[PDB]
Amino acid sequence: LHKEPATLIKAIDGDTVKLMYKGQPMTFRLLLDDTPEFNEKYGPEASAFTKKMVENAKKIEVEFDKGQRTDKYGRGLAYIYADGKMVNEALVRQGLAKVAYVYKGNNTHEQLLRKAEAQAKKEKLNIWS
Numbered sequence: 001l002h003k004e005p006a007t008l009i010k011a012i013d014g015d016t017v018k019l020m021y022k023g024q025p026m027t028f029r030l031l032l033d034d035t036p037e038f039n040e041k042y043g044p045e046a047s048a049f050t051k052k053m054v055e056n057a058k059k060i061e062v063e064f065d066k067g068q069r070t071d072k073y074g075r076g077l078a079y080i081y082a083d084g085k086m087v088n089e090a091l092v093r094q095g096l097a098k099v100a101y102v103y104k105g106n107n108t109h110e111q112l113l114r115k116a117e118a119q120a121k122k123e124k125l126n127i128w129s
């Protein structure tokens, strides 16, 4: 896979963010994550964690996987990096997202994320407390 440039337009919630990609505004949904909705437990914390990660970054990048690049709602489906750190992985490692929505072709980082989930669960972090 390859990392491509983007810039932050606005944080939205734990697993969606609005970025400018190839000069166009797009909402991205983070591959392989399911954060709780803002109105659910750990929802606000997940939104806050992603917001801090993308707002503080000097450089955002998006990385598409091998499969579909947009979902049925027109959201971009990618791995998002903030100063080289993958937000998709970080949310899982901190117990603020579950690994979810693992569809064939878009699962390059599946094993990396499941290893993070196992550690978050062992630590009884957040969702796993």
Ligand SMILES: Cc1cn([C@H]2C[C@H](OP(=O)(O)O)[C@@H](COP(=O)(O)O)O2)c(=O)[nH]c1=O
Binding pocket: 029, 030, 031, 032, 033, 034, 071, 072, 077, 101, 103, 106
């Ligand atoms: C993460 C992701 C979600 N989706 C679709 C499936 C779900 O459809 P439904 O809306 O019919 O439940 C929805 C979940 O996203 P959210 O967790 O943002 O609600 O987005 C994909 O199709 N591909 C994906 O990789």
Ligand SMILES: [Ca+2]
Binding pocket: 015, 034, 035, 036, 037
């Ligand atoms: Ca969600």
